[PDB]
């Protein structure tokens, strides 16, 4: 997986899947390895599935591919979430 941070919106809650529970994660990929890696990374970062705002994923029944998007903006309510996730990445890549 390749991860980038920028200011482009590619998924919307009124068009694709709003992942709220790890059981619902099964609708985002066609391979068990990819699902396992996604859950692995999200739990390594430190996301509480049933306590923090969800993230968005695309359903498998499309010939597009695999994409998943997280909101980590630095304003409004999400500001606070931006802190949490931030620290997460700060403890894995040895840099940021």
């Amino acid at each position, epitope marked *: 997986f390749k991860i980038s941070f920028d*200011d*482009i919106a590619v998924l*919307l809650p009124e068009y694709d899947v709003i992942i709220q529970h790890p059981a619902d994660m099964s609708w985002c990929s066609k391979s068990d390895d990819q699902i396992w890696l996604s859950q692995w990374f999200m739990n390594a970062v430190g996301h509480d599935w049933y306590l923090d705002p969800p993230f968005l994923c695309r359903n498998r029944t499309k010939t597009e591919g695999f994409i998943f998007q997280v909101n980590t903006s630095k304003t409004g309510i999400n500001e606070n979430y931006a802190k949490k996730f931030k620290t997460g990445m700060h403890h894995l890549y040895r840099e940021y």
Partner: antibody
Amino acid sequence: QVQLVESGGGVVQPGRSLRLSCAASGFTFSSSAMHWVRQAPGKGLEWVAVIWSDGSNENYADSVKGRFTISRDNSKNTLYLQMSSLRAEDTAVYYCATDKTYVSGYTSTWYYFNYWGQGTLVTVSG
Amino acid sequence: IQMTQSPSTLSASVGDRVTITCRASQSIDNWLAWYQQKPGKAPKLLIYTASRLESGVPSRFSGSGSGTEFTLTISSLQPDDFATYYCQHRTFGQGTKVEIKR
């Protein structure tokens, strides 16, 4: 230069299904979604049909749901649209346009029409 | 996702700076495009994602906004611009007519 031609239009009686052709050349036709859009004479535009590059997933507006259907021939670089159960309200100008599925490093159905044809006229009248 | 435009008809002259506002029912981030149309012609896309400018488009056009509200701005109005303009996210806008004033 990207070139696109539309044909298969004119004046037709109601109750007859019509087949319209949209030929494309100059780009990788197998890797770009296609759209059909409609404008009634004197009114604004309206998105009608969309097909992605794989040829598997389609989408249509509710006003033509169940009556219109688009397919494509990648070998012949052609797009074929069928219209059925025609009414007087479907008389309009039809365009077929190529979508831009790449924006700054991402691939999806952005619903951006980038290259257009001269536009055909369909007159459903008796 | 409904969309609405303001105003419907606009009057301007050569060299004027003109603004068009487009409001969506619910937040769509930056998923919006601005199109130009002339009488008896084919629609030509102008603005990507409310920010970027398509190659070949005059530099006097630009866009801004986000979320639910967006705006198209023309700094200097040229004779080739008296036309109809549309903003599209899901469907098209109702159309704003940039028209000469006399």
